């Protein structure tokens, strides 16, 4: 019998699809990894369960433990879903700038929300989470930007899925960097296994921190943290490509209309970059894997 015991056993094992029309000028093959096939429609499902599994396996989860994380993105959604499956109490902090729709989605999974001053952005959500953790020892904070289970799950699952499904033929992996876990985990495994493989990090042109620029506001959700995440191994990254807001939005829209792939803005951004790499004649005949991190419907 093939029956999952709970929804967390159905995380990962996402498929690859060849891009057919959003390929203008490509001389390389572009295939997309569809992370919206995860049960809560984003790549973060992988780390939501990984960081909690890791904590359980390390005996850090106690009878009175409350899961707590500062996040206005998919990590909150993933954690909320995994806590619902696990039967854990989930508390999330985020600026009151978060949409009402997103709040409703988190509450639907039974997460509890602590809204922080809109003007204070993420630092306010983080500060509140830091204080709550200090004053109450029941709180367990996954710390997605520093937790080693983040890149680790990507080594064990994401990287192997890419390796197997391409039968080892993968030449280049293109991925947007939020926590940096996806690209790091995949590089760690594939680059050791196939030293000729190359890895392209993607970030917003409006917030080109990995390139040496400064933090700025940008709409490409899931990427562009405005700092270099500890989890990222910048020495495995062979290239950074910046992507503008319009190009990201345009290509995201092209993916839905021309490929039937309704994906988020960050998927547009990663594909902008995969398209740019695919146009280089030295990459003729190569196989490029681009990670599409989430589903488009979330972005109404």
């Amino acid at each position: 019998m093939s029956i999952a015991e709970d929804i967390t056993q159905l995380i990962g094992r996402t498929p690859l699809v060849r891009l057919r029309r959003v390929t203008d000028g490509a001389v390389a093959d572009i295939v997309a990894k569809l992370e919206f096939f995860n049960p809560a429609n984003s790549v973060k499902d992988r780390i939501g369960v990984a960081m909690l599994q890791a904590a359980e396996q390390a005996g850090l989860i106690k009878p009175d433990t409350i899961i707590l994380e500062p996040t206005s993105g998919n990590t909150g959604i993933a954690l909320a879903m995994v806590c619902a499956a696990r039967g854990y109490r989930c508390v999330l902090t985020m600026p009151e700038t978060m949409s009402l729709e997103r709040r409703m989605l988190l509450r639907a999974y039974g997460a509890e929300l602590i809204l922080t001053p809109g003007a204070d952005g993420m630092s306010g959500a983080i500060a509140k989470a830091e204080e709550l953790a200090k004053t109450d020892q029941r709180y367990f904070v996954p710390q997605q930007f520093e937790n080693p289970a983040n890149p680790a799950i990507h080594r064990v699952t994401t990287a192997e899925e890419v390796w197997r499904d391409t039968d080892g033929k993968v030449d280049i992996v293109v991925a947007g960097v939020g926590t940096g876990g996806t690209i790091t985990g995949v590089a760690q495994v594939i680059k050791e296994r196939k030293p000729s493989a190359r890895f392209v990090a993607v970030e917003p042109a409006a917030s080109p921190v990995l390139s040496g620029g400064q933090k700025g506001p940008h709409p490409i959700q899931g990427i562009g943290a405005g700092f270099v995440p500890p989890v990222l191994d910048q020495d495995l990254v062979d290239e950074i490509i910046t992507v503008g807001n319009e190009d990201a939005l345009n290509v995201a829209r092209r993916l839905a209309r021309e490929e039937g792939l309704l994906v988020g803005i960050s998927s547009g951004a990663a594909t902008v970059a995969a398209l740019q790499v695919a146009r280089r004649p030295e990459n003729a005949g190569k196989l490029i894997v681009v990670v599409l991190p989430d589903f488009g419907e979330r972005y109404l």
């Binding site: 993105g73 998919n74 600026p95 952005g121 959700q221 899931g222 562009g224």
Partner: peptide, 4 residues
Amino acid sequence: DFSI
């Protein structure tokens, strides 16, 4: 601000 960032949404991750």
